[PDB]
Design a protein around this ligand. Sequence first.
Ligand SMILES: [Cl-]
Length: 310
Amino acid sequence: MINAIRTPDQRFSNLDQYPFSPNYLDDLPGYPGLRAHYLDEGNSDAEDVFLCLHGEPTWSYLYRKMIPVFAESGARVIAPDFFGFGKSDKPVDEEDYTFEFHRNFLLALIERLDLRNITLVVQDWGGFLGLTLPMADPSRFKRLIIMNACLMTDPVTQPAFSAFVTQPADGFTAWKYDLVTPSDLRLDQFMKRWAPTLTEAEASAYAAPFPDTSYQAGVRKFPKMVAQRDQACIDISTEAISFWQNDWNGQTFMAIGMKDKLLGPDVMYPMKALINGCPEPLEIADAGHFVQEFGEQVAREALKHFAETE
Ligand SMILES: [Cl-]
């Protein structure tokens, strides 16, 4: 029904440090005919599930240094690829991707796999979407690991969650320009700019899912949805603020990539106050937006904080 395309499997032959086996679902309710890929690592019977959500313009490859730490801890880790990214199917028109399309795909996945005792791991889009998930079924979520992300609320309710779209010129403005304007978007070049410590091989794993522009619709829509928040996103993100401030009673661990021009401290301190019980953030001086690239520190500290209360 949704015209979609699928990345050829050979594009992923030569991946650097990505030894995880694929799992796919093509029978989700509301997602007829679309195949979603997700990693399922560690013990499939563990009590704890770390649900690892990625953002723009990445994929589950992003969580590759953190996955083995969470798995060795005894947890089951689920790291799905949103449709339009990684190894899931990719709808061809940008009009098909909406906040709820991706949100509902997450609640569907979660119900489909019946995930319980979830430690939500978010950053960017994975947090814009992922932070509005617990209020939907509070009982299945028990901890949160939040790296640079916030809620897509209206400007008046939280100016901090909106100011970054316009200032500074080299933060979000540049990021969106680099993503929506080029008629020939090279994701390996994009990633090396925004994540300067990546090796060539790593950079190239981020361009792996997209052979040509035709597979990039999902990638182009995300930034435009940060810029143009529709009513449903606004409503639902507004309502999640209340959930984190008042309803939330789990364990949280926050890690800020200090060099992030997009969602660094001016956005993370504010988020930290709205999340009940959130503790002092772990500032990682050398990390930019992709906190995950400095991921192992994050995973072991989180697990250390979490054990120190369990
Ligand atoms: Cl974005």
